[PDB]
Amino acid sequence: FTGYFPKSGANFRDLSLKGTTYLSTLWYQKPFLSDFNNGIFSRVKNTKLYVNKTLYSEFSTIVIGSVFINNSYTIVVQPHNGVLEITACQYTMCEY
Amino acid sequence: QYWVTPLSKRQYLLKFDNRGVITNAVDCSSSFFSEIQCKTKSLLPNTG
Amino acid sequence: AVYYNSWQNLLYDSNGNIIGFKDFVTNKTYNIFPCYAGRVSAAFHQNASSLALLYRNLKCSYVLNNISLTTQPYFDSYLGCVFNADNLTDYSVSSCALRMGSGFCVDYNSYRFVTFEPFNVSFVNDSIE
Amino acid sequence: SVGGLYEIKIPTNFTIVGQEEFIQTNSPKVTIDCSLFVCSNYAACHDLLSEYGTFCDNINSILDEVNGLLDTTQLHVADTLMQGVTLSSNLNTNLHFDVDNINFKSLVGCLGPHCGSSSRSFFEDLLFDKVKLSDVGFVEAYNNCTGGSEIRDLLCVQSFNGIKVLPPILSESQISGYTTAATVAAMFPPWSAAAGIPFSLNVQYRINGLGVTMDVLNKNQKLIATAFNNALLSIQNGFSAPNSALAKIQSVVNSNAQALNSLLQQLFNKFGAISSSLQEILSRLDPPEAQVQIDRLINGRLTALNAYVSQQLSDISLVKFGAALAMEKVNECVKSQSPRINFCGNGNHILSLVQNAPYGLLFMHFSYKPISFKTVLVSPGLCISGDVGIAPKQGYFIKHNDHWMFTGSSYYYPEPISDKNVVFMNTCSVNFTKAPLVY
Amino acid sequence: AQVQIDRLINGRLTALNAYVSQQLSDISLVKFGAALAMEKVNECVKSQ
Amino acid sequence: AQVQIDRLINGRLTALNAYVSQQLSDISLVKFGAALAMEKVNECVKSQ
Amino acid sequence: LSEYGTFCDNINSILDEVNGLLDTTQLHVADTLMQGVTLSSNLNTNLH
Amino acid sequence: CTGGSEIRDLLCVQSFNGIKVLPPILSESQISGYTTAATVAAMFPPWSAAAGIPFSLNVQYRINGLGVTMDVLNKNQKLIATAFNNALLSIQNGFS
Numbered sequence: 001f002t003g004y005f006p007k008s009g010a011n012f013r014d015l016s017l018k019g020t021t022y023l024s025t026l027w028y029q030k031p032f033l034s035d036f037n038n039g040i041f042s043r044v045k046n047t048k049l050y051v052n053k054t055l056y057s058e059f060s061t062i063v064i065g066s067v068f069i070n071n072s073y074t075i076v077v078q079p080h081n082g083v084l085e086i087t088a089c090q091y092t093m094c095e096y
Numbered sequence: 097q098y099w100v101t102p103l104s105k106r107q108y109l110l111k112f113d114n115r116g117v118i119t120n121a122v123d124c125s126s127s128f129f130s131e132i133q134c135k136t137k138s139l140l141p142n143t144g
Numbered sequence: 145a146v147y148y149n150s151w152q153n154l155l156y157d158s159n160g161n162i163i164g165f166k167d168f169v170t171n172k173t174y175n176i177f178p179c180y181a182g183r184v185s186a187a188f189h190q191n192a193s194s195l196a197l198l199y200r201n202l203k204c205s206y207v208l209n210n211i212s213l214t215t216q217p218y219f220d221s222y223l224g225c226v227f228n229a230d231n232l233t234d235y236s237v238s239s240c241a242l243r244m245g246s247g248f249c250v251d252y253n254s255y256r257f258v259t260f261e262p263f264n265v266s267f268v269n270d271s272i273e
Numbered sequence: 274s275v276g277g278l279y280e281i282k283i284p285t286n287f288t289i290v291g292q293e294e295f296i297q298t299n300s301p302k303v304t305i306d307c308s309l310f311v312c313s314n315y316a317a318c319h320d321l322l323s324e325y326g327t328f329c330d331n332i333n334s335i336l337d338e339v340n341g342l343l344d345t346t347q348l349h350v351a352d353t354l355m356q357g358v359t360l361s362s363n364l365n366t367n368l369h370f371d372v373d374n375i376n377f378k379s380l381v382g383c384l385g386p387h388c389g390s391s392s393r394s395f396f397e398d399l400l401f402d403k404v405k406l407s408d409v410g411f412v413e414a415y416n417n418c419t420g421g422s423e424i425r426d427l428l429c430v431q432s433f434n435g436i437k438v439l440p441p442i443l444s445e446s447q448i449s450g451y452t453t454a455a456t457v458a459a460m461f462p463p464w465s466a467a468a469g470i471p472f473s474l475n476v477q478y479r480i481n482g483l484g485v486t487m488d489v490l491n492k493n494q495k496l497i498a499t500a501f502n503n504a505l506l507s508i509q510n511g512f513s514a515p516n517s518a519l520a521k522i523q524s525v526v527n528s529n530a531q532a533l534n535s536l537l538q539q540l541f542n543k544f545g546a547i548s549s550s551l552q553e554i555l556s557r558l559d560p561p562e563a564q565v566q567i568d569r570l571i572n573g574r575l576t577a578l579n580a581y582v583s584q585q586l587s588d589i590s591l592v593k594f595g596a597a598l599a600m601e602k603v604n605e606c607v608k609s610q611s612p613r614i615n616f617c618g619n620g621n622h623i624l625s626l627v628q629n630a631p632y633g634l635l636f637m638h639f640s641y642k643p644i645s646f647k648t649v650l651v652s653p654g655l656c657i658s659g660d661v662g663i664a665p666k667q668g669y670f671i672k673h674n675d676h677w678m679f680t681g682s683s684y685y686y687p688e689p690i691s692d693k694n695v696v697f698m699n700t701c702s703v704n705f706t707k708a709p710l711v712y
Numbered sequence: 713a714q715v716q717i718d719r720l721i722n723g724r725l726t727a728l729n730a731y732v733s734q735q736l737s738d739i740s741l742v743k744f745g746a747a748l749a750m751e752k753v754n755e756c757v758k759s760q
Numbered sequence: 761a762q763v764q765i766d767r768l769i770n771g772r773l774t775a776l777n778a779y780v781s782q783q784l785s786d787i788s789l790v791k792f793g794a795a796l797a798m799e800k801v802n803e804c805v806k807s808q
Numbered sequence: 809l810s811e812y813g814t815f816c817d818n819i820n821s822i823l824d825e826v827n828g829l830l831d832t833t834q835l836h837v838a839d840t841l842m843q844g845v846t847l848s849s850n851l852n853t854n855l856h
Numbered sequence: 857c858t859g860g861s862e863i864r865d866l867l868c869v870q871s872f873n874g875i876k877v878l879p880p881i882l883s884e885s886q887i888s889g890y891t892t893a894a895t896v897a898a899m900f901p902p903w904s905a906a907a908g909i910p911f912s913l914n915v916q917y918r919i920n921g922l923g924v925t926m927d928v929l930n931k932n933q934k935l936i937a938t939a940f941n942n943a944l945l946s947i948q949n950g951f952s
C-alpha cells in the first residue's frame with residue numbers, strides 16, 4: 001500500500017517542552033518551530049499524573065498553521081483529560 | 097514526550113492478522129532487507 | 145463476522161477485489177463469492193446424431209438445479225455429470241477415440257461411458273511354485 | 274610397481290545400497306479458456322476480443338496439442354511398463370509376496386480387476402499421500418468448488434477464470450497397476466521382466482558380473498537377501514525425512530501452482546489502463562473511451578497467455594525428454610541390465626526396480642557397496658610356460674601362500690588360476706610378471 | 713491513418729513473435745527426434 | 761510524456777518477453793547437450 | 809512501469825529458473841566427472 | 857567497468873543498462889580440476905576410470921576387441937603408444 005508514512009530508520013524528535021514559571025524565547029524558534037511539508041507522524045506519551053490517587057492525563061498541545069496570524073486558520077489539537085479538543089480557527093496566536 | 101517525524105508518500109508492506117489488525121509493516125525503500133521483504137511480500141523471506 | 149470496526153464496511157482480498165461487506169442499514173454481514181463459471185466437455189463421434197456431454201467436477205443435481213434443465217439421460221460419473229451416455233464402467237475398451245480422463249472413455253455403437261484399458265497382462269495358467 | 278605388481282584395495286566385505294530416482298514423465302494438463310480468461314462475462318470485451326480473432330484459437334490449439342503430447346507420452350510410458358509382461362493366472366499377491374528370502378510385499382499392490390482401483394503398493398501409497406495435488410487431488414479440489422464452502426480455494430478461483438487442470442487419460446491407479454504387474458513379473462515364473470530366471474539368481478549373476486566370485490555369493494545368499502530388503506526398507510524410510518526424490522516430486526506440483534497463480538495474477542495487472550477490472554471501466558466510461566481501456570487489458574492478457582504458452586511448450590519438451598529417459602531406464606535397468614556403467618544410477622549397479630509416483634516414475638537402483646578393504650599386491654597379467662600370456666577376467670592375479678592365484682576385482686577371495694577366469698595370448702606382453710611354474 | 717496502421721503493425725508483429733516462439737519449440741523437438749534417429753541408425757541398422 | 765513513455769515500456773517489455781522465450785528454448789538444447797556429455801563421460805571415458 | 813504489475817517479476821522469475829537449471833546441470837556434470845574417482849595420495853604433478 | 861579506461865566495452869554498456877552475465881556456481885578452474893582427476897584416474901592404480909587395469913593394457917584390449925590379434929598388438933606396444941601420443945599431439949596442434 002502507498003500512503004503518507006514515516007521513513008523507517010529515520011529519527012523522531014521529542015519536541016515536548018516542560019517549564020515551571022519561565023519561558024525561553026529560544027523555545028519558539030527553529031528547530032522547535034518546524035516545517036510541516038507533506039505532514040508528520042506523532043508518538044505522544046500520555047503523562048499520567050495523580051492528585052488524591054485520582055488519575056489525570058496530560059500531554060503537549062500541537063498547533064499546525066502557516067503564519068499564526070488571525071488572517072489565517074490555525075489547527076489546534078489539545079487534550080482535556082480524556083477529551084481531545086480539535087479546532088481550526090482564525091486565532092490571534094501569542095508570541096510565546 | 098511528543099516525538100514527531102516527517103511523513104512522505106511511501107510504499108509499505110502491511111500485514112493484517114486473522115482479525116484485521118495491522119500487526120507488522122515494512123518500509124520498502126528503507127533498506128536492502130526491506131526491499132527483499134517487499135519483493136517476496138513476506139516478513140521472513142526464504143533463504144536465498 | 146466480528147472483524148468490522150465502527151468505520152469499516154467492506155472486506156478486500158490481497159488483489160483489491162470486494163469479497164465481503166457489512167450492510168449499512170441492517171448491519172448484517174455477508175461474504176461475496178464469484179458466480180459459477182466453467183466449460184462443457186462434449187464428446188462427439190462422426191457416426192452419431194448427438195453428443196455425450198461431461199460437466200467436469202459438477203454433480204448432476206447442481207447442473208440441473210443451477211445451470212440448465214435437459215431431457216437427456218444423466219448420471220454422476222467420477223469426472224462429473226455425464227449426459228446422453230450409458231454408465232458402463234464395468235465394460236472396458238483397449239482403443240478409445242474419446243478419452244475423458246482417469247481411465248474413462250466414451251464409446252459409440254448410443255454413447256457408452258466405459259473404462260479405458262489400453263494395456264493388459266498376457267496371462268498363462270502355469271504353476272507359480 | 275614393485276617387481277611386476279601394483280598395490281590395490283580389494284573389498285573383503287560388502288552390502289547392497291538402494292538409491293531413489295524420481296523421473297518426471299508427466300505434468301498437470303493445464304487448459305485455458307482464452308475467451309473466459311481475457312473477458313470474463315463482459316459483452317463489451319467479447320466484442321473487441323473477436324477483432325483479435327485467431328489469437329484465442331492459437332492459445333487453445335497450442336495447449337490442445339501440448340496436452341495431446343502429454344497423453345501420447347503417458348500411453349508410451351504405460352506401453353513400456355507393460356511390454357513383454359507375462360504373469361501366471363495362479364498369482365495371488367495376498368499370499369505370494371516373497372521368494373528366496375527377498376520381500377516385495379511393499380512393492381506389490383493387489384493384482385487383478387476384482388480389487389477395482391486398489392491396485393497400489395504400500396510403497397506407492399506412502400509416496401502418494403505426501404503430495405496433495407495428484408490427479409485425484411485435482412479432481413477432489415475441483416469437485417469442492419460448488420460445495421458451498423466458505424473456503425476460497427485458489428484452484429476454484431483459477432477454474433472460474435478459465436484456468437483448469439484436466440486429469441491424465443490414464444489414472445495414477447492404472448499406472449500403479451502397470452508398475453505392480455512389471456514388479457511381480459520379476460519375482461515369479463515365467464520371470465518375463467528378470468531375464469527369464471529367478472530374481473535371486475538374477476541378483477547373484479549381476480553381482481558376479483561385477484568381479485565377485487560365485488562361491489561367496491551362493492553361501493552368503495541369506496546375507497544378500499537381507500541386505501537387499503534392508504536397502505528397500507532404507508528407501509521407504511527415506512521418504513519420512515527431507516528427501517531429494519520427494520522434493521523433486523513436490524517441485525512439479527509447486528512449479529505448476531506457481532505458474533497458474535502467476536497467470537491468474539495477470540487478471541489484476543492494469544497494463545497502463547485506469548483499472549484492471551472490466552466492471553470498473555464499464556461503470557466509469559462510455560464506449561468511445563471504455564473500448565480504449567478494454568483494448569489495453571486485452572493486449573496485456575493475450576500477451577500473458579502467449580508468454581504462458583511459450584513457457585508451457587518449453588516445460589513439456591523437458592517432460593518429453595524426462596519420459597524418454599524413464600522409458601529407457603525401464604527397458605535398460607528394470608526389464609534388463611544393459612552394459613552401461615552409470616546409466617542406472619551411480620556405483621556398481623546390480624539391478625533396478627520401478628514404482629509409480631505422482632507425475633512420473635520412481636526407480637530404486639540397487640548397487641554393490643564395498644564395506645571393508647584389503648590392500649593387496651596384484652599382477653595385471655602373467656607370462657607362463659612357453660612365454661604364453663594370460664590376463665585375468667574381471668579380476669587380478671595374487672601371490673597367495675607364495676603361489677599364483679586369481680581373485681575377483683570386487684571381492685577378495687583367492688581361487689586357483691584356470692581357463693574359466695583367464696584370457697589367453699600366444700605371446701605375453703612386456704612387463705607381465707614372469708611365472709614359468711604356472712599351469 | 714498512422715494510428716490505425718500502428719494497431720495492425722502491433723498485432724501482426726505480436727503474431728510473428730508468437731509464430732517464431734512456436735517454431736523454436738518445434739525445431740527443438742525435431743533435433744531430439746533426429747538424435748534418436750541417428751542413434752537407431754548406429755545401434756539398430758549398422759550394428760545391434 | 762506518459763503516452764510516449766508508455767509506447768517505449770510496451771516495446772521494451774515485448775522485447776524482454778521475446779528474449780526470455782528464446783533463452784528458455786536455448787537452455788533446453790543446453791540441457792540436452794549436457795545429458796549427452798554426461799552419457800559420453802560414463803560410456804566413453806570411464807568405460808567403453 | 810509499476811502500473812504494469814507483475815511483468816518484471818515474471819521476467820526475473822523465468823530468468824532465475826533458467827539460471828537455476830544451468831547451475832543444477834553444471835553440478836550434475838561435475839558429479840558425473842567425479843563419480844567413482846579414487847586417486848592415490850602419492851600422486852605428484854611434477855614427477856608422474 | 858569502473859576503471860579509468862578510454863575504451864568503451866560493450867559489456868559495460870550492457871551491464872549499466874541492466875543486462876549482465878553472472879559467473880557459474882562452479883568456476884571453470886574447479887571443472888578443470890575434476891577433468892584432471894578423471895584423467896589421472898586412468899593412468900595410475902587403482903585405475904578407477906580405466907576398468908581397474910593399466911591404461912596401456914586397456915588400449916591393447918580395446919584394440920583386440922575390434923578383431924586385431926593380441927600377438928602383433930603386444931609386439932608393437934611402442935608403435936601403438938607413439939601413435940597414441942602423436943594422435944593427442946595432432947588434436948592439440950589442430951586448435952592453431
Ligand SMILES: CC(=O)N[C@H]1[C@H]([C@H](O)[C@H](O)COC(C)=O)O[C@@](O[C@H](CO)[C@@H](O)[C@@H]2O[C@@](O)(C(=O)O)C[C@H](O)[C@H]2NC(C)=O)(C(=O)O)C[C@@H]1O
Pocket residue numbers: 017018019020021022023024
Ligand atoms: C525544556 C526544559 O529544559 N525543561 C526543563 C525545565 C527548564 O530547564 C526550566 O524550567 C527553564 O527555566 C528558564 C527558562 O528559566 O526545568 C524543569 O526542572 C526544574 C529544575 O531544572 C524543576 O525542578 C523546577 O525547579 C525550580 O527550582 C525552578 O523554578 O526552576 C523550582 C520548581 O518548583 C521546579 N518545578 C517543578 C516542581 O516541577 C522544570 O520543570 O521547570 C524540568 C524541565 O524538563
Ligand SMILES: *[C@@H]1O[C@H](CO)[C@@H](O[C@@H]2O[C@H](CO)[C@@H](O)[C@H](O)[C@H]2NC(C)=O)[C@H](O)[C@H]1NC(C)=O
Pocket residue numbers: 150169170171
Ligand atoms: C448499526 O450499527 C451502528 C454502529 O454500532 C449503530 O449506530 C450507533 O447507534 C447508537 C444508537 O443510536 C448510537 O449511540 C451510536 O453513536 C451509533 N454509532 C455510530 C457509529 O453511528 C446503528 O444504530 C446500527 N443499526 C442497526 C439497524 O442495527
Ligand SMILES: *[C@@H]1O[C@H](CO)[C@@H](O[C@@H]2O[C@H](CO)[C@@H](O)[C@H](O)[C@H]2NC(C)=O)[C@H](O)[C@H]1NC(C)=O
Pocket residue numbers: 219220221231232233234389
Ligand atoms: C455406474 O456403474 C458402475 C458399475 O456398474 C456402478 O458401480 C457399481 O455399483 C454397485 C452397486 O450398485 C457395486 O456393487 C459395485 O461394486 C460397483 N462397481 C464398481 C466398479 O465400483 C456405479 O455405482 C454406477 N454409478 C451410477 C451413478 O449409476
Ligand SMILES: *[C@@H]1O[C@H](CO)[C@@H](O[C@@H]2O[C@H](CO)[C@@H](O)[C@H](O)[C@H]2NC(C)=O)[C@H](O)[C@H]1NC(C)=O
Pocket residue numbers: 371372373374375473494
Ligand atoms: C529354497 O526353497 C525353500 C522351499 O521352497 C525356500 O524356503 C521358504 O523361504 C521363505 C522366505 O522366502 C520362508 O518364509 C518359508 O518359510 C520357507 N519355506 C520352507 C518350506 O522352508 C527358500 O527361500 C529357497 N531359498 C533359495 C535361496 O532359493
Ligand SMILES: *[C@@H]1O[C@H](CO)[C@@H](O)[C@H](O)[C@H]1NC(C)=O
Pocket residue numbers: 191252253
Ligand atoms: C462409422 O461408420 C463407417 C461407415 O459406415 C464405418 O466404416 C465405421 O466402422 C463406423 N464406426 C463406428 C464406431 O460405428
Ligand SMILES: *[C@@H]1O[C@H](CO)[C@@H](O)[C@H](O)[C@H]1NC(C)=O
Pocket residue numbers: 236237238263264265266267
Ligand atoms: C486385453 O483386453 C482386450 C479387451 O478385453 C482383449 O481383446 C485382449 O485379448 C486382452 N489382451 C490379451 C493379451 O489377451
Ligand SMILES: *[C@@H]1O[C@H](CO)[C@@H](O)[C@H](O)[C@H]1NC(C)=O
Pocket residue numbers: 269
Ligand atoms: C491350462 O490351459 C490349457 C489350455 O486350455 C489346458 O490344456 C490345461 O489343462 C490347463 N492347465 C491347468 C492347470 O489349468
Ligand SMILES: *[C@@H]1O[C@H](CO)[C@@H](O)[C@H](O)[C@H]1NC(C)=O
Pocket residue numbers: 285286287644
Ligand atoms: C560384513 O559386514 C557386516 C556389517 O559390518 C558384518 O555384520 C558382517 O559380519 C561382515 N562379514 C564379514 C565376512 O566381515
Ligand SMILES: *[C@@H]1O[C@H](CO)[C@@H](O)[C@H](O)[C@H]1NC(C)=O
Pocket residue numbers: 410413414417420422
Ligand atoms: C473437499 O471438501 C470436503 C468437505 O468439506 C473435505 O472433507 C475435503 O478435505 C475437501 N478436499 C479438498 C481436496 O478440498
